[PDB]
Amino acid sequence: YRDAFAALAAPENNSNPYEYMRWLREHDPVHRSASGIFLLSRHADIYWALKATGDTFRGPSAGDLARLFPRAAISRSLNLLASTLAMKEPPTHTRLRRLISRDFTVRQIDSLRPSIVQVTQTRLGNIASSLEKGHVVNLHEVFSVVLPMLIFAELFGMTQADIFELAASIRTILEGLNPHASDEQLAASDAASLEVERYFEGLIEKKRREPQSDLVSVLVSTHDDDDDKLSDTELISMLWGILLGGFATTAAMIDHAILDMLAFPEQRRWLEGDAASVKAFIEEVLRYDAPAMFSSIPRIAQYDITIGDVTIPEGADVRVLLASGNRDPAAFPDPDRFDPSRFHGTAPGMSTYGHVLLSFGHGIHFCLGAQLARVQLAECLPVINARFPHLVLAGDPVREPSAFLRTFRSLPVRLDTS
Ligand code: HEM
Ligand SMILES: C=C1C[C@@]23CC[C@H]4[C@@](C)(CCC[C@@]4(C)C(=O)O)[C@@H]2CC[C@@H]1C3
């Protein structure tokens, strides 16, 4: 193909991109795309680049943005991205993360468990009704996206109406946030972000009118109290960005977890065990299918960086192929074997041999929602396993095409009565 970004976006590799990634890792581990964007596919390089973000790598400066992203000036989505905390280093990053971190702590995620349980039981009850009638159910549409959408809305300060009203817009924006995005895709993303901006403009007034115990209300109060703690552009970027991160990747992990259950029935037993056993299954789900193969966030080299025979020049945009690092045999031996024991009894995300899964990133931009995602999976997956021992696929799952995300359009299932 033209470059690795073209290969990953190609239909031929949409079903199982990991053979291409194995090819890339083995033949061009420090890949230089046609546009000059680099892509690291080895776990060791990826881990280094993530951990070294702060000095060796930084988010784009104003100069970098104009140089590397000449459209950013006429792209609503790129300009919104430029002011998210994922593009920043301390002290700016510290200030912005400090404003949102409380809502995502272990303690605050615990407070969401009653809602997670109630949504899980409510939706699975309706789903069990249809399945028992012999119906085919699109589990992605009626559960996988529904649970994280509703839980995120409660945390964030959105009504259930708003989040369903924007799911379509959110997914079109997401697809525009990658180098290979077509002019058509980026235009639609820009239009959808103005819509999202329109919604938040209204939501902002509502939460200024009636503050409540949600994230949007605290950001607005922090901004309204003092926009040098959170500027106008930082506020809208934060609202936009957290919405983009708030459920799509979590739903993808629920989808992939269900497929793992069906594909590896001998490993479903892990979901019947104690908390540590359930968590271990979910960590292996996260290693096996990172929902973002690489991250939309650019990392700009602050030095000329020589890696083996390849030199990344100062100022170059470097991306990290998280999904390839997760299946890099140097970090995870026999990497295509699905085995929850890799993460059983260890620190979250850490293998028994001391190698981290990369699906949540690492370093200063380590995923803020990691506990939120893990806990939703930990609550719902054992209930799904116990309720449908005879779940089977009813046709092939339909993936949503994308250059970098691993989401689904459908996960059709039925009950096997035999
Ligand atoms: C399975 C689910 C999820 C996955 C796989 C995932 C993935 C990631 C990745 C790879 C990064 C690092 C990006 C980079 O360093 O270039 C990240 C950061 C982040 N994620 Fe998650 N995410 C998930 C769920 C969530 C949720 C539910 C939220 C809710 C708000 C969220 C919010 C964020 C934020 C705000 C950051 C930026 C943190 C910072 O820059 O300090 N994510 N995520
Ligand atoms: C506030 C924010 C939430 C954030 C988390 C990470 C997430 C994005 C970048 C959207 C695309 C997928 C993913 C996983 C990525 O890193 O590619 C999202 C939007 C902007 C920033 C970073």
Side-chain angles (χ1 to χ4, degrees):
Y1 305 79
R2 181 62 169 162
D3 51 31
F5 297 104
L8 290 169
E12 310 87 74
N13 299 310
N14 178 264
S15 182
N16 174 20
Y18 285 98
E19 278 287 282
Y20 176 76
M21 296 196 229
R22 185 183 208 95
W23 177 92
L24 189 65
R25 204 172 47 246
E26 291 174 346
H27 298 100
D28 200 3
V30 189
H31 167 80
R32 183 189 176 283
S33 71
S35 58
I37 299 178
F38 283 81
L39 185 65
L40 309 175
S41 49
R42 281 191 305 235
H43 183 284
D45 302 334
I46 294 165
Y47 179 90
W48 157 71
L50 294 168
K51 185 72 181 165
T53 297
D55 179 45
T56 298
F57 296 103
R58 289 175 74 84
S61 67
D64 296 331
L65 207 67
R67 171 177 60 86
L68 292 160
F69 302 90
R71 278 198 299 287
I74 64 141
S75 175
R76 189 61 190 128
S77 297
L78 295 178
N79 200 254
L80 285 166
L81 185 68
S83 290
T84 64
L85 80 167
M87 305 283 269
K88 307 301 184 184
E89 299 79 48
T92 296
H93 173 264
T94 312
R95 171 173 54 84
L96 295 172
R97 183 146 181 156
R98 220 184 250 124
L99 295 176
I100 63 177
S101 60
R102 179 188 193 262
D103 306 56
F104 294 90
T105 60
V106 170
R107 160 142 192 192
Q108 295 309 129
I109 300 306
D110 280 334
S111 75
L112 288 167
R113 288 181 181 272
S115 291
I116 295 167
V117 169
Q118 194 59 87
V119 170
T120 290
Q121 293 298 344
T122 291
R123 297 295 145 206
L124 293 182
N126 303 139
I127 292 160
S129 91
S130 311
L131 287 178
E132 279 154 2
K133 301 179 195 310
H135 296 0
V136 171
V137 177
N138 181 347
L139 212 45
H140 163 89
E141 203 79 351
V142 303
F143 188 86
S144 299
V145 298
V146 175
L147 173 63
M149 285 175 65
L150 296 183
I151 299 305
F152 172 79
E154 179 181 351
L155 176 156
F156 201 46
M158 297 173 68
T159 70
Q160 303 190 346
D162 308 336
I163 198 77
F164 281 95
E165 179 194 336
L166 297 170
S169 291
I170 293 168
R171 186 62 191 84
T172 50
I173 296 168
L174 286 171
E175 189 58 27
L177 297 175
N178 77 85
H180 188 260
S182 67
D183 294 349
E184 309 88 274
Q185 290 170 327
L186 183 47
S189 170
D190 291 330
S193 302
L194 296 166
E195 168 187 1
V196 168
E197 194 162 8
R198 296 217 175 123
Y199 163 77
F200 276 121
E201 288 167 7
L203 177 53
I204 287 171
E205 286 190 22
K206 177 173 71 196
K207 303 293 168 175
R208 192 157 26 212
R209 256 160 90 221
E210 271 187 47
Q212 260 144 31
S213 274
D214 49 54
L215 183 49
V216 172
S217 294
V218 171
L219 293 169
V220 167
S221 301
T222 299
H223 167 247
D224 291 329
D225 281 20
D226 181 358
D227 57 12
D228 278 337
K229 271 165 161 290
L230 182 68
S231 73
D232 296 8
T233 54
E234 288 172 345
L235 175 63
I236 188 65
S237 285
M238 184 73 74
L239 295 172
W240 176 88
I242 293 174
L243 182 62
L244 293 187
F247 67 87
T249 42
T250 302
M253 291 325 302
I254 296 177
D255 285 327
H256 280 97
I258 295 169
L259 300 177
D260 294 335
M261 292 166 54
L262 304 178
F264 309 105
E266 75 289 358
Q267 307 301 335
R268 290 178 64 161
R269 37 141 176 159
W270 288 83
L271 293 172
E272 303 170 340
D274 56 17
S277 184
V278 178
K279 289 204 239 155
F281 185 95
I282 289 160
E283 293 306 279
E284 183 68 339
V285 167
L286 285 162
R287 185 195 69 88
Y288 209 61
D289 293 283
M293 290 182 293
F294 62 89
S295 170
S296 314
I297 303 307
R299 286 173 163 77
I300 309 309
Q302 300 302 296
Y303 305 84
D304 293 334
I305 293 162
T306 45
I307 300 175
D309 62 311
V310 189
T311 290
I312 304 172
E314 190 184 338
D317 176 359
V318 181
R319 306 303 171 90
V320 287
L321 195 56
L322 309 170
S324 173
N326 279 338
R327 301 220 197 169
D328 180 354
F332 299 101
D334 199 9
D336 291 352
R337 192 179 91 249
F338 184 87
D339 192 340
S341 71
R342 304 177 189 272
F343 301 101
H344 187 215
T346 60
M350 183 72 78
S351 85
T352 57
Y353 292 107
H355 299 130
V356 295
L357 67 85
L358 299 165
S359 310
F360 287 130
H362 194 87
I364 61 170
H365 301 300
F366 180 80
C367 178
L368 184 69
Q371 180 72 356
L372 176 56
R374 286 178 166 124
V375 168
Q376 291 179 77
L377 296 147
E379 290 281 11
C380 76
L381 281 179
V383 177
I384 291 165
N385 181 59
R387 190 172 300 221
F388 313 121
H390 307 303
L391 201 69
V392 300
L393 293 171
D396 296 332
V398 178
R399 292 179 177 277
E400 178 67 45
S402 169
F404 73 119
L405 291 167
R406 303 291 288 160
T407 73
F408 290 85
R409 289 179 178 278
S410 78
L411 201 172
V413 305
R414 70 180 186 82
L415 293 187
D416 176 16
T417 55
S418 67

